[PDB]
Structure formats: structure tokens, C-alpha cells
């Protein structure tokens, strides 16, 4: 199937019509998405198959065809861009200054942007175009608004 680097929609035909369940990143021959999008299932790319290679429910991440390749990190100061890929709509860049999730194990960047559930796995980028994490695992705050962690994996 298609191995070209870039952002991809993750679709299923199990439900009514063709439904977008999430999004992912192809980089260095590896497909990267959030665990809750695929539940670790195999994926099809044209006539080819992509098998899971690494995954972790707690990190909510999964890689296909090889180990996790994305290692850029938010610098903690600069605006970033969400490359949102919503269901049935064109890819669009949204610039924002991340907030912070403070946890008992350290702080993580967070983006306060609200998109349909099927946008999970969309990449968040720095000014060099590097993927610093994936959008789609977060929380609902007091005023009912959605804030996503900037979720990044480890490159072994």
C-alpha cells in the first residue's frame, strides 16, 4: 500500500457507510496513532497489511511496521500547530499556545482545541514541522471545554 510519509485518516466499514475513527502519522516506514483509535487491530493500506509492532494502553499509543519513530518535544514556550484532520473535511492547521497538564510524574503540554472524536491521532507540530505528539487523549474541564494532552512516545 501507500508508504509515503504524511498524515492519514483511519477508516472503518464495520459501522454505517465509511466512518472515520481517527488519524495517524506515517514516518520512516512506521504508522503511528493512538491506541483508542484502533484498539491494536491490523490495518489495511490499499492491498497491503500493517501489523501492530508496539503499543501501550496507558500512554494511549500504538505503532505499526516498526518501533515508534517520533521523538520531537514541545520546548515549553512556543506556539505549535495542530494539523487537524476532521471526518469528511480537509486537513487544516490551527496554531495555538499550549497549556500544561501537571501530574504527580511531571508536566505535559496540552492543547485546548475541540474537534470530533474521529480527529484523534492528528499530529501536533513545532515550527520545523516535526511531530511533537498526537492529539486526542485528554479531559473535559469545569466550563465543559476539551483539552488534549500533547501525547508523545519514546524512540528506543
Amino acid at each position: 500500500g501507500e508508504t509515503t510519509d504524511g498524515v492519514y485518516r483511519v477508516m472503518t466499514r464495520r459501522l454505517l457507510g465509511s466512518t472515520q475513527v481517527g488519524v495517524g502519522v506515517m514516518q520512516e516506514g512506521v504508522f503511528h496513532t493512538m491506541w483508542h483509535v484502533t484498539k491494536g487491530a491490523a490495518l489495511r493500506s490499499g492491498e497491503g497489511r500493517l501489523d501492530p509492532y508496539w503499543g501501550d494502553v496507558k500512554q494511549d499509543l500504538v505503532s505499526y511496521c516498526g518501533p515508534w519513530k517520533l521523538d520531537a518535544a514541545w520546548d515549553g514556550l512556543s506556539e505549535v500547530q495542530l494539523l487537524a484532520v476532521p471526518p469528511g473535511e480537509r486537513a487544516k492547521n490551527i496554531q495555538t499556545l499550549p497549556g500544561i497538564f501537571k501530574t504527580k510524574d511531571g508536566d505535559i503540554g496540552a492543547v485546548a482545541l475541540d474537534y470530533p472524536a474521529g480527529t484523534s491521532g492528528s499530529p501536533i507540530l513545532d515550527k520545523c514541522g516535526r511531530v511533537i505528539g498526537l492529539y486526542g487523549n485528554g479531559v473535559v474541564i469545569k466550563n465543559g471545554s476539551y483539552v488534549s494532552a500533547i501525547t508523545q512516545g519514546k524512540r528506543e
Partner: protein, 39 residues
């Protein structure tokens, strides 16, 4: 059965729409990968 379809290149867009606030939140992460607010 799940399948992927290319949606675009990964690049920074000069003069993209700028929005969203930057909240600082105390959160907890459980073993199932769910984030929750700590109050």
C-alpha cells in the same frame, strides 16, 4: 476492518488560523490511559 487513506503532508503553515487558550491543570492518569482533573 480498518484502512488508511492519505490526507496530507506534515508541514507548518505560515499564517495559519491562531486560537485556543493555554490552561494550567492538575491532572491524574489512570492505568486505563484516562486523564481526570484533580481538585
Amino acid at each position: 476492518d480498518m484502512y488508511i487513506e492519505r490526507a496530507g503532508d506534515i508541514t507548518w503553515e505560515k499564517d495559519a488560523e491562531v486560537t485556543g487558550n493555554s490552561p494550567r491543570l492538575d491532572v491524574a492518569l489512570d492505568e486505563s490511559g484516562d486523564f481526570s482533573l484533580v481538585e
